[PDB]
Amino acid sequence: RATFQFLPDEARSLPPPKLTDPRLAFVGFLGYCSGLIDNAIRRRPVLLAGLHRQLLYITSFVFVGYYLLKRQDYMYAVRDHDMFSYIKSHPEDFPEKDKKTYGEVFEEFHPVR
Template sequence: MSAHLSAIDLLKLGDEDRKKPFLNQYWPYIIGVPFGIGTGVMINFGTRRPVFSGIQKHVVGVAGWCALLNYVQNKRDAYFAEKDAVYRHYIELHPEDFPTPERKKLADVFEPWVPIR
């Protein structure tokens, strides 16, 4: 992959070029399991029963939380995909607004350092 990409090249990178974070695909389950178990525990605590009695409440809670968070993740992915498509379309229509940035050396970016004693 080139070190210097234009704006449209950055948006056209395919899935094989982008590395997704590990937790990005598992966060609904990592959060859904404790929340689902906690929901069953809180229901039992509120009704003055032993906290882990009625295991079906815990199973339904885990399934419900995981399904809800999975739905949220899918909506979030669709939102960002649409947002990227709008950006890509705008950049394709107006390439003059997005010139390829010129290369700079690090020495040109930093100001000279003057020690103050």
């Protein structure tokens, strides 16, 4: 809602992503893969070389991914808050139907002969 803000203040009333979020685990995995590719293109032992470098790949991805996931969750909360409030403001456009049962509704039968 706030102009050119990555995370408006109201976003703090939502629960933050857990640090065991499955989406966050995937992002951390992508950082691990990036670390491996870095060793491979530079012709270093892929698994062993530069564990300090590999750690920072995992850490940076998880750090950025945590905030992206938080904004992602915030934008979907905002979408629903907007959508439900609009429905409340315009009842005549979203009228509750009278729900007929299947014993009353006539559906045509199409034999598979």
